[PDB]
Design a protein around this ligand. Structure first.
Ligand SMILES: CCc1ccc2ccccc2c1CNC(=O)c1c(OC)cc(O)c2c1OC1=CC(O)=C(C(C)=O)C(=O)[C@]12C
Lengths: 11, 260
């Protein structure tokens, strides 16, 4: 998991 | 009709842009020119004024650099939110979404930073502060040479006189670049960009009827921004290598890691 992915998945 | 849909897309992007980015170019120029009523920005032009305005907005050079990093991190999050509003973006392979942001965020940061700049300085802290270009350029190396490039670009880019409606589409086109290194599914991205490009062309023809050359110039600016970011990343790897005890934010480290 990456920080960019986490930001992208946050609804 | 097709054109009507392109205008609806342009409006959607503008509305999303306004929701994602607190300080728009319209709000920024209203402050720079001084045609507003709210409290004017505190001016920082030297070491002394910087000390005084800390509440309004390590050695100075490092302190200023860290300040830019904090704003960059906030900016990356705003750009990510905007990207998610571009039709079709969230349906792309998740890893491709990451790749588009990784390679596109700094190009967008340079672009949008220009909105808050003039030949003499840059607005900071949501426009509550104004730091002069001369002050930032006077910073000891390799920090002074890190600030100036953004102003050099801003001066040229601002000469194009784009407004927020133009910028919203321009930014979208940049994010949806099908030629970023490592993308897995190129066609879906190229198809979205082709439509965004049509929307941008119509936007410029209607909004800047007396400047036929604007679209072509903006396409060239997209190309220039890549070389511009390359130099940015390089000057940064130098700082992270020559400046000991330097702290690079995790989000920024992730974006810079393995970047072309
Ligand atoms: C997007 C970040 C970026 C990248 C390159 C730039 C090159 C030239 C000018 C501004 C640049 C900027 C924008 N830079 C800024 O917005 C910026 C700045 O610019 C000099 C100086 C500065 O002092 C600060 C800035 O933003 C800040 C947020 C913080 O959290 C700080 C705290 C509390 O410590 C800061 O220190 C602030 C107030």
């Amino acid at each position: 998991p990456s920080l960019l992915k986490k930001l992208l998945l946050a609804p | 009709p097709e054109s009507a849909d392109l205008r609806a897309l342009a409006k959607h992007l503008y509305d999303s842009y306004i929701k994602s980015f607190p300080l728009t170019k319209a709000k920024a120029r209203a402050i720079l020119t001084g045609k507003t009523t709210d409290k004017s920005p505190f001016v920082i032009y030297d070491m002394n004024s910087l000390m005084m305005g800390e509440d309004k907005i390590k050695e100075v050079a490092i302190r200023i650099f860290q300040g830019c990093q904090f704003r960059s991190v906030e900016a990356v999050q705003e750009i990510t939110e905007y990207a998610k509003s571009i039709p079709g973006f969230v349906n792309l392979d998740l890893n491709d979404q990451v790749t588009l942001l990784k390679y596109g965020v700094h190009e967008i940061i340079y672009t949008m930073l220009a909105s808050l700049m003039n030949k003499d300085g840059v607005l900071i802290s949501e426009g509550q502060g104004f730091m002069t270009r001369e002050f930032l350029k006077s910073l000891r190396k390799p920090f002074g040479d890190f600030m100036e490039p953004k102003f050099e670009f801003a001066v040229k880019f601002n000469a194009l006189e784009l407004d927020d409606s133009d910028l919203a589409i321009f930014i979208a086109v940049i994010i949806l670049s099908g030629d970023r290194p490592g993308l897995l599914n190129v066609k879906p991205i190229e198809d979205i960009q082709d439509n965004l490009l049509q929307a941008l062309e119509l936007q410029l023809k209607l909004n800047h009827p007396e400047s036929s050359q604007l679209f072509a110039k903006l396409l060239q600016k997209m190309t220039d921004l890549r070389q511009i970011v390359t130099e940015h990343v390089q000057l940064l790897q130098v700082i992270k290598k020559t400046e000991t005890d330097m702290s690079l934010h995790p989000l920024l480290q992730e974006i810079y890691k393995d970047l072309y």
